[PDB]
Amino acid sequence: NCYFPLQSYGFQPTYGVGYQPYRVVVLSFELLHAPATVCGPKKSTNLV
Amino acid sequence: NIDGYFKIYSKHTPINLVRDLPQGFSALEPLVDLPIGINITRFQTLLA
Ligand SMILES: *[C@@H]1O[C@H](CO)[C@@H](O)[C@H](O)[C@H]1NC(C)=O
């Protein structure tokens, strides 16, 4: 009942669509306690 | 430092004087502004 805590995944291009590997990005952000130092892009239109 | 925006205004101007801070008039243009957010209470320079 002593166990090493980690269990490395096994990857084979043969595996089921689920046991196959899947990359993740979590776009986390922590919000609204300081000056903003990011924005989304601000559009522009040609000048008349 | 203004609400976590840290601002610099500055000048280089030529002179010819022996002793004291020259009497006269010139203004400082804004140079840069950085949203550093922190609480500066004190500061030091850097000689070489
Ligand atoms: C800056 O200082 C004020 C007063 O101590 C405090 O309310 C604020 O939470 C501080 N902010 C940071 C980023 O430490």
Side-chain angles (χ1 to χ4, degrees), chain B:
Chain B
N1 178 26
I2 302 299
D3 307 337
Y5 289 90
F6 181 96
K7 294 172 187 287
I8 307 189
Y9 310 76
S10 71
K11 202 56 157 272
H12 160 214
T13 188
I15 64 156
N16 283 309
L17 186 60
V18 61
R19 181 83 159 285
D20 203 357
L21 182 71
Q23 189 272 9
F25 199 86
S26 190
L28 319 185
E29 301 85 38
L31 177 59
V32 62
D33 178 9
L34 306 178
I36 69 177
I38 73 177
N39 295 314
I40 298 157
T41 308
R42 63 195 188 163
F43 92 109
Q44 185 180 33
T45 191
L46 296 176
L47 279 62

Side-chain angles (χ1 to χ4, degrees), chain A residues 18-44:
Chain A
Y19 195 6
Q20 289 173 13
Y22 294 60
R23 288 181 181 207
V24 164
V25 180
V26 180
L27 294 188
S28 118
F29 13 86
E30 281 286 14
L31 301 179
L32 302 155
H33 296 293
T37 316
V38 176
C39 269
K42 300 180 185 181
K43 200 169 187 171
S44 186

